[PDB]
Amino acid sequence: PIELLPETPSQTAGPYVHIGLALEAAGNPTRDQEIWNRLAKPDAPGEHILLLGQVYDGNGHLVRDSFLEVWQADANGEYQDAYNLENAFNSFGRTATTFDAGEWTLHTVKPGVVNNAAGVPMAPHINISLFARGINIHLHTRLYFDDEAQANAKCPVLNLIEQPQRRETLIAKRCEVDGKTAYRFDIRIQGEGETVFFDF
Amino acid sequence: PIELLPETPSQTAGPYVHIGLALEAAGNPTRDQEIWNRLAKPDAPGEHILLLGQVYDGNGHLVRDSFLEVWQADANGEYQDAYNLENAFNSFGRTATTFDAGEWTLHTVKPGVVNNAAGVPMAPHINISLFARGINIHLHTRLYFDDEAQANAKCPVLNLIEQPQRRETLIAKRCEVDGKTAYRFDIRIQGEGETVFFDF
Amino acid sequence: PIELLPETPSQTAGPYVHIGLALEAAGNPTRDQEIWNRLAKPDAPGEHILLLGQVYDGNGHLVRDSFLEVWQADANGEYQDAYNLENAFNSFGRTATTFDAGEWTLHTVKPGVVNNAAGVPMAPHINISLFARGINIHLHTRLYFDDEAQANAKCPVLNLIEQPQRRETLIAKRCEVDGKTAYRFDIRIQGEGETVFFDF
Amino acid sequence: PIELLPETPSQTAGPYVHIGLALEAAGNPTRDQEIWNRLAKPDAPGEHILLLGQVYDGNGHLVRDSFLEVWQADANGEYQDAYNLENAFNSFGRTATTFDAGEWTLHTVKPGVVNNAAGVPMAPHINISLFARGINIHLHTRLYFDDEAQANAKCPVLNLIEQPQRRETLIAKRCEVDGKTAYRFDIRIQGEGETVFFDF
Amino acid sequence: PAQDNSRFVIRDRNWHPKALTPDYKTSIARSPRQALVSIPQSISETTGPNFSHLGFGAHDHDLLLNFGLPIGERIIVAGRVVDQYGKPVPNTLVEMWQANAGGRYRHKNDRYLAPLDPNFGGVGRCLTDSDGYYSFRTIKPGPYPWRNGPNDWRPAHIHFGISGPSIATKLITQLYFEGDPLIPMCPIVKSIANPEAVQQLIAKLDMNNANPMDCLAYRFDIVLRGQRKTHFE
Amino acid sequence: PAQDNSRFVIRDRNWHPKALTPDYKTSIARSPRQALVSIPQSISETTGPNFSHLGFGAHDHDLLLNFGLPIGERIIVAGRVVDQYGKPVPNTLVEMWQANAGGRYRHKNDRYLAPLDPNFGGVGRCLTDSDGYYSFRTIKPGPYPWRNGPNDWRPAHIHFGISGPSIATKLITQLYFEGDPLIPMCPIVKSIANPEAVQQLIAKLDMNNANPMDCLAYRFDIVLRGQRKTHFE
Amino acid sequence: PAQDNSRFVIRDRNWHPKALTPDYKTSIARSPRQALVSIPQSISETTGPNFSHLGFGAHDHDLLLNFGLPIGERIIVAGRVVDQYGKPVPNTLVEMWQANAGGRYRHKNDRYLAPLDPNFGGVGRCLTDSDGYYSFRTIKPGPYPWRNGPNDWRPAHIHFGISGPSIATKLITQLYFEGDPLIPMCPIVKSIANPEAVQQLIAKLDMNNANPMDCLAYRFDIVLRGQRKTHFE
Ligand SMILES: O=C(O)c1ccc(O)c(I)c1
Ligand SMILES: O=C(O)c1ccc(O)c(I)c1
Ligand SMILES: O=C(O)c1ccc(O)c(I)c1
Ligand SMILES: O=C(O)c1ccc(O)c(I)c1
Ligand SMILES: O=C(O)c1ccc(O)c(I)c1
Ligand SMILES: O=C(O)c1ccc(O)c(I)c1
Ligand SMILES: O=C(O)c1ccc(O)c(I)c1
Ligand SMILES: [Fe+3]
Ligand SMILES: [Fe+3]
Ligand SMILES: [Fe+3]
Ligand SMILES: [Fe+3]
């Protein structure tokens, strides 16, 4: 068969990822422009929401050194690739969990519906990549919302998970924080209620 | 780099370890001098105590063919390496689990405090090595006492275990047997409450 | 380590170099345009000078088949790389030693000062490459002027030569030929007073 | 044949040898006890002399970064191996040439006569080892005195040098410095008057 | 906005390290037990951020100046980012972090006894050029001990993050230095089953790029997932 | 009392058999799932009992008399105990146990149909001398079937226990006999991943140590962890 | 006083670098043109100073303390001094000097741009013990450019000076570090014609002597000329 060049092999980020990708957290001076956890400026169109979660290891212990990257469509269901701190909305962000409490937070807007390759619409979702010490190659998952049940029922992606019980691991639970619409999305790396992770 | 001679590889003790290191148990005649479970003679200085426990496998079943070795300082926190049946106290001992009940016992004294290489005191502890069928290489652990919480909280060794819930697996629970001071130390080889095993 | 394609290997020019690069000298018909020893036209700005010299071998014998290439800045200390027979000044020239007298001559102007990479001024000098039969790979050297002592004392290149006595080998002695300003620069390939040769 | 373990290969001392073996000269703080250029204290028996010299390279240029070690007998022709700063006399010493003047000096006494392996007397001499940048393996030589012509003429070592003119290279010339008896010993590493160097 | 025009060659999960690699202790409790679910590529996975307009500082990529001069071996780390089809990946984001000359990281959690270097930070970023090239100026990091086995030492390395054209191509890896004896003993390195794959992570000494009498140079090229046009879709 | 004056070379856990080795059925339920926690060496770990003054009986090391003569192959099992540096380990306790010639152990739980031997016990102990030498006199044990796979048989072996200078050095192993065809088929033996390590467990026929017209001999040297003095600690 | 009691095996001047090695530029003008004169060994050459009574400071051998802590890779450099016959050389003087972690030397003549380290001198001395063992505690020196060819860089190295029992054994050498890619490119290293001889100068990584969580260790054994008793003289 035909073989192309092999992709460069992945390596864990280690415990000090923060010094490189999350300066503040490393407890170090930051640069003029940093890629952080605020995708939307308050003047951005769409429903402003706060996302928060904890990451657990197979023993049910908090993973206090995780790093997360998110990719999502804007409110119209459009992916905004041109990253600029001037933009009201950026499709990309980064967050990490507290060395203390161990919770990450993200400030964005509820993404709009996007069609799959076959023209079938997918339920609103946030694409997430998880990085950390002990994770050789990052984990891919999706955050869906519990208040989009109608949509979730028909998602061609969610429909790909054989067992209905597993689909629920992908559904963030709506709440409110300081009077703001928040969604809690805990990731269980292993064991009971282990989160669905994808390959694409 | 520099390579030394390789250490001889470990092998499981097997189910018949008793004929070799626990004669009585094998149900065989013993020799004049044997290394057994009585570290201290009644006239030995320090607080006399009874140690007892059970060993569980990964399915929650009792491991009835287990063999144990202990190493501990005397009441003055001094290691008495000169093994002699005439001594009032021996720092070293051996025990095994009953084919019926599956419980092991030891007659000793609560150990004195010893300092680590850096001069820091360690909490009173008993060094344990566990051998049995199914166990390729012996497992090392330590037995701490629940009534030494102050010392325990400051142990440079206990402090090396990352997860606090994991530290609790090393703490023996004080009790009384026939009105005698005893401590119970159960070992969970696998699964829920799995005991911390060390490498050194 | 990273290895690039290897440079094509040098080879001596041989005794007949003239037929290819010094037609006149080869005593053959020249072509319309030829590259020779007149870098400056009468009306080229700067102090017009005559450069002359001889080349000596290890035995103190004259080298009568030498081919030289020179590169120098103009009176303004500027390098004129667009070679043209029309130019009043060309930064490049070629000359050779007479099969008889064995002396080469070049008609040029005294070069202006140029800065080294670090921003330090180098004394006025002419870059020469000497080719000839017996020379596998061409020798690189520099011609400095005796009447620029002050500058000479400070040249970053000249001061790179460890022993002061060796520096003197690079200084041309001013003279007058037909009431014209000249400078003589003899090259000693080997031995007593061997001329400093560079690697770059 | 029988081959033993090969000796560790020698390497040049390089230019910073002083830091390591001539502290003062590196211009660094010295330690309590240093091995230096004063082999005899004023009350040492024998005739107190001053030794001095320069070292030349193949070009007749001064080697200003040379390091020298000396080994000699006392006034009684005795080798004192037990090195001690308390001693009235030490047979071992070290010296180096000035970064400026480039002249080395030594304060000792004229060595008594010692016999060779065959029981034959050698003329009073001082054993020298020369080290420096550009020298891959140290050079061994001997210093003899011009005022010992009789002894010199019968020296079994001096006599090994085929050519008489070469022996001259090893004879120090008597002088007086501050009304003190001194001998000058110049080393010429290469070329005209090249000093004799040994292999042993 | 982003367009679903591309498809990315499927990842070889046997080339990359697996999640469960017990010698690397922390991987035990941090690896999934269920199989990953494969999903068809959609616009969601085939698009990603473009950092062409991030406001990079003048010494973003110069660790000698971006924090006195640091103590340590002055080097340049350079290379190119290409895809599996060998096509350059222009204007892509390259991020790196590392320890000082002594293996000490400027991070609160680093308690190693090697001291901090008053003139050294350890962070850099660079956007590849039209040809997929990048370069950084820094000091070679030192190895350091870590709590894995009782005597584990990481080989000297630089941590790297690369974005690429989409989130399907984004990768975090580690650069190792040619000849380092610590390489083959590392459980993290060995998380990779194929020794051929390990070779891709070793930066080669590059004398051609060095600055004579100043600093040495290392060459590190990166290969991202092959990008192709959709067809007969 | 004992003093903290030594350090022991860290164990190579890739050399030794791993805990989880599925072909050896009982290891499934009897292996940890969490990683071992590495600790610095202290007086606790670097000290151990000295058996110098134990009262050893006259035939402690002679299985031919310590229990008529037993039926089976009369053999001498001897060797030396050294550290990884090659330094002898004097006055150290060596303990052993084995089955009879038919593969039957003198243990209540053994119901293998091969009969017991009225003159054979199967236990021995020996304190190594000034040069690290130990020696035992016994009979060569037979192989025996065990409940693993439907047709699993243990190669003939002698179980060994050795003390060394500290608890850090304490080891339990098995000796196998040179050329036994059952060796490479055993799941317990195979628990050891490197065939090179396997070789260390095979006692070699030692014709030089044999007693003509009496008994054969086998040589089995044991290597304990390297002992070194602490420096710059 | 000293006594002419021994002979030293003749030096192999094809093993050691020759005097004239033109790639190493300075050697051209500082190498003799005449042949060395061989002379028989006498008391003059077979004796030497004994440094046993030199008053050595407490940190004479600890470069970490003899000059804050220095910046760089903490390592122990240890080994043994033996003669060609494999006999240890006790109470012998071992002296060393090296650059700091950046390749900077504490010498007036060093103008390389890497900065000095306020806590590092770079000089040590140690008297070998009864077994010929020496050890130093220092930081790993960095490579540095030098004026030879236009892009020449010395591999990281430590300068060594060993006394031995006499002036005949006295030696000055350099230690190189295992795997350094710079080694095969060095004109000085290359002054040594035989690759096998080059290997003797390469210090090996010694994980067994390392202080876990503290410092690495390198092993450098030194072979001095064999010493024998005179016979039939
Ligand atoms: O402490 C650790 O586990 C640790 C530290 C640094 C680093 O780069 C890695 I990967 C792991
Ligand atoms: O019956 C078993 O499983 C069994 C018996 C003896 C023995 O030495 C071993 I290892 C295992
Ligand atoms: O005569 C000679 O030396 C000679 C002639 C022709 C040629 O190409 C060469 I090179 C040398
Ligand atoms: O400058 C030089 O030539 C130089 C410097 C240091 C050193 O160790 C050596 I060898 C040579
Ligand atoms: O990759 C593996 O080894 C792996 C994956 C999933 C799983 O549940 C187990 I157990 C092992
Ligand atoms: O060593 C192994 O294979 C191993 C270790 C731990 C663990 O939890 C698992 I699943 C496998
Ligand atoms: O070793 C050599 O190459 C060597 C020695 C002496 C000498 O005069 C010359 I020319 C070369
Ligand atoms: Fe058995
Ligand atoms: Fe030709
Ligand atoms: Fe790291
Ligand atoms: Fe040097």
| Rounded CA separation A186/F222 (Å) | 52
Q: How far is CA E194 from CA C153, E225, E226, G231, in A?
A: 61, 18, 20, 61
| Contact of D138 with D11, CB cutoff 8 Å | no
Alpha carbons D38 and D92: distance in angstroms, whole number: 9
How many pairs of residues across C and G have Cβ atoms under 8 Å apart?
4
Q: Is D167 helix (H, G, I), strand (E, B) or coil?
A: helix
- Candidate from F14, F34, F39 with C-beta closest to E28: F34
Nearest residue by C-alpha to atom 11 in ligand 1: A14
Instruction: Give the sign of the dihedral formed by CA A92, CA A98, CA A102, CA A103.
Output: negative
Phi and psi angles of residue F4, each rounded to the nearest 5 degrees, phi first: -85, 90
Kindly report the backbone phi and psi dihedral angles of residue B90, in degrees, each rounded to the nearest multiple of 5, phi listed first: -125, 130
Q: Is the dihedral of CA G16, G18, G22, G26 positive or negative?
A: positive
CB atoms within 10 A of CB E199: 11
Q: How far is CA D78 from CA B140, D72, D93, in A?
A: 65, 8, 15
Q: How far apart are CA G110 and CA G113, in angstroms?
A: 9
Residues of D in contact with G13 (CB under 8 A): 137, 199
For residue E150, which residues of chain F lie inside 8 Å, CB to CB?
10-11, 38-40
Instruction: Please tell me the distance from the alpha carbon of residue E133 to that of residue E156, in angstroms, as a whole number.
Output: 23
- What single letter denotes the amino acid at residue C137? I
* Domains and their CATH numbers in chain C: 1-200 (2.60.130.10)
How far, in Å, from the CA of A16 to the mean position of ligand 1?
Answer: 7
**What CA–CA distance (Å, rounded) separates G102 from G80?**
28
Q: F128: how many CB neighbours lie within 10 A of its CB?
A: 24
Contact by Cβ (8 Å): A63, A35: no
- Nearest CA-CA distance, residue E142 and chain A, Å: 15
Give the Cα separation of C51 and C128 in Å (integer): 12
CA atoms within 13 A on the CB side of G232: 0
Q: A183 has which bridge partners?
A: A51, A174
Torsion of CA E139, E140, E145, E148, to 10 degrees: 120
Q: Neighbours of F (≥3 Cβ pairs closer than 8 A)? A: B, E, G
CA of G28 to the centre of ligand 7 (A): 10
Helices (H), chain E: 43-46, 195-199
Q: How far is the CA of F156 from the centre of ligand 8 (A)?
A: 8
Reading the block at residue G162, the tokens are 């060993």
Distance (Å) from the C-alpha of residue E150 to the closest C-alpha of chain B?
A: 6
Interatomic CA distance for residues G178 and B60, integer angstroms: 51
Rg from Cα positions in chain C: 17
Resolution of this deposited model, Å: 2.2
Whether the CB of B15 sits within 6 Å of ligand 2: yes
Contacts 24+ apart (CB under 8 A), B143-148: B143/B51, B143/B170, B143/B172, B143/B183, B143/B185, B144/B170, B144/B171, B144/B172, B145/B110, B145/B171, B145/B172, B145/B174, B145/B183, B146/B171, B146/B172, B146/B173, B146/B174, B146/B183, B147/B174, B148/B123, B148/B124
Residue D73: CB atoms within 10 A of its CB come to 27
Whose atoms come closest to the Cα of C11: which ligand? 3
Q: Pick A19's closest partner by Cβ from E45, E106, E191.
A: E106
Which ligand 2 atom is the nearest neighbour of the CA of B13? 10
Rounded to whole angstroms, the Cα distance separating F8 from F12 reads: 12
With 0-12 / 13-18 / 19 or more C-beta atoms within 10 angstroms meaning exposed / middle / buried, residue D119 is exposed
Question: With the CA atoms of E67, E68, E74 and E78 taken in that order, what torsion angle do they form, in degrees rounded to the nearest 10?
Answer: 30
Task: Reduce the DSSP state of residue C27 to 3 states and report it.
Answer: coil
Q: What does the radius of gyration of chain E's CA atoms come to, in whole angstroms?
A: 19
- Quote the CA–CA distance of F35 and F29 in Å, as a whole number: 16
Q: Which residues in F101-112 are b (16+ Cβ under 10 Å) and which e? A: bbbbbbbeebee
Taking the CA of residue F109 as reference, the ligand 2 atom at the shortest distance is: 1
Give which of B188, B169, B194, B168 is closest to B56, Cα–Cα.
B188
Distance CA E135, CA E218 (A): 10
With a 6 Å cutoff on the Cβ, whether G33 touches ligand 7 is yes
C3 CB burial (10 A radius; 0-12, 13-18, 19+): exposed
Residue from F48, E29, F17, F36 nearest B140 by CA: F36
Task: Tell me how far apart the alpha carbons of residues B33 and D91 are, in angstroms, rounded to a whole number.
Answer: 66
Task: For residue E105, give the nearest of A12, A16, A115 by CB distance.
Answer: A16
The DSSP result for A62-115, as a single string, is B-TT-EEEEE---TTS----B--TTSSB-SEEEEE--SSS-EEEEEEEPPPPEE
| DSSP-based three-state secondary structure for C20 | helix
Q: Where are the alpha helices (DSSP H) in B15-96?
A: 17-21, 23-26
Distances in Å between the Cα of F98 and the Cα atoms of A182, B133, D105, F95, F161 are 68, 15, 79, 11, 12
Which amino acid is residue F66, in one-letter code? N
H/E element, F169 = none
Q: Which amino acid is at C66?
A: S
| Residues present in chain F in total | 233
Which residue type sits at A21? L
Cα of F39 to nearest chain E Cα, Å:
6
Q: How far apart are the first and last CA of chain G?
A: 22
Residue A165, chain B, CB below 8 Å: the answer is: no
Residues C5 and E190: their CA atoms lie apart, in Å, by 33
User: Which region holds residue E28: left if phi is over 0, alpha if psi is between -120 and 50, else beta?
Assistant: alpha
* CB contact (8 A) between residue B199 and residue E149: yes
Instruction: Take residue D103 and report the two structure tokens written for it.
Output: 């002249």
For residue G205, give both structure tokens: 């990584």
Most informative mutation of C16, C17, C137, C138 for ligand 3 (most atoms within 8 A of CB): C16
| CB distance E28 to ligand 6 below 6 Å | yes
Q: Which two tokens stand for residue C82?
A: 């667009």
Q: How far apart are CA G116 and CA G120, in angstroms?
A: 8
Neighbors of chain E by Cβ distance (3+ pairs < 8 Å) = A, B, C, F, G
Q: How far apart are CA F155 and CA F152, in angstroms?
A: 10
Please give the structure tokens belonging to residue A195. Answer: 């989160």
Q: Is E38 helix (H, G, I), strand (E, B) or coil?
A: strand
H or E stretch at C18: helix C17-21
Check if C134 has its Cβ closer than 6 Å to any atom of ligand 3: no
- Please report, to the nearest 10 degrees, the dihedral formed by the alpha carbons of residues G58, G62, G66, G69 taken in order: -130
Residues pairing with G2 in the sheet: none
Q: How many residues does chain G have?
A: 233
Interface of A with B in 22-61 (CB under 8 A): 59, 61
Q: How far, in Å, from the CA of A61 to the mean position of ligand 5?
A: 20
Helix (H, G, I), strand (E, B) or coil at E61: coil
B133 is in an annotated binding site: yes
How far CA A62 is from CA of A97, A136, E20, E225, in Å, comes to 9, 18, 19, 32
Instruction: Give per-residue burial for A113-146: e unless 16+ CB within 10 Å, then b.
Output: ebebeeeeebbbbbbbbbbbbbbbbbbbbbbbbe
Q: How many CB pairs under 8 A join A and E?
A: 260
In B, minimum Cα distance to G204 occurs at B1
Asked whether B and D share 3 or more beta-carbon pairs under 8 angstroms, the answer is no
CB contact under 8 A, F54 and B83: yes
Instruction: Name every chain C residue with its beta carbon within 8 A of the beta carbon of D59.
Output: 163, 165
Cα G182–chain centre separation: 18
CA angle, residues F40, F221, G80, in degrees to nearest 5: 60
- HSE, CB side, 13 Å, CA atoms: give it for residue E84: 20
* Structure tokens, D44: 């040492």
- Give the residue from chain G lying closest to D6, CA to CA: G84
Per-residue 3-state assignment (H helix, E strand, C coil) for C147-167: HHHHHHHHCCCHHHCCCHHHH
DSSP 8-state class, residue C9: P
Distances (CA, A) of C103 to C9, C16, C67, C108, D137: 29, 17, 11, 16, 45
Rg of chain F (C-alpha set): 19
Is residue F61 within 8 Å of F124, Cβ to Cβ?
yes
Q: How far apart are CA E8 and CA A157, in angstroms?
A: 18
The Cα–Cα gap between F76 and F62 comes to 9
User: Cβ of E227: how many Cβ atoms within 10 Å?
Assistant: 21
Distance D59 CA to ligand 11 centre (A): 25
**H helix runs in chain F, sequence order:** 43-46, 187-190, 195-199
CA distance A68 to A59: 21
Residue where the block lists tokens 């007998």: D73
C-beta G13 within 6 A of ligand 7? no
B8 touches chain A (CB under 8 A): no
Q: Is B134 in the pocket of ligand 2 (CB under 6 A)?
A: no
**From F16, F74, F80, F105, active-site residue:** F105
- One DSSP character per residue, B83-135 reads --TTSSB-SEEEEE--SSS-EEEEEEEPPPP-B-TTSPBPPSEEEEEEE-TT-
CA distance E177 to E172: 17
- Taking residue C63's Cβ as centre, other Cβ atoms within 10 Å add up to 18
Fold that domain E1-233 belongs to in CATH: Protocatechuate 3,4-Dioxygenase, subunit A (2.60.130)
Pocket test for ligand 6, best of F24, F31, F34 (most atoms within 8 A of CB): F31
Q: Ligand 6 mean position to B194 CA, how many Å?
A: 13
DSSP state of F71: S
- What CA–CA distance (Å, rounded) separates D143 from D105? 13
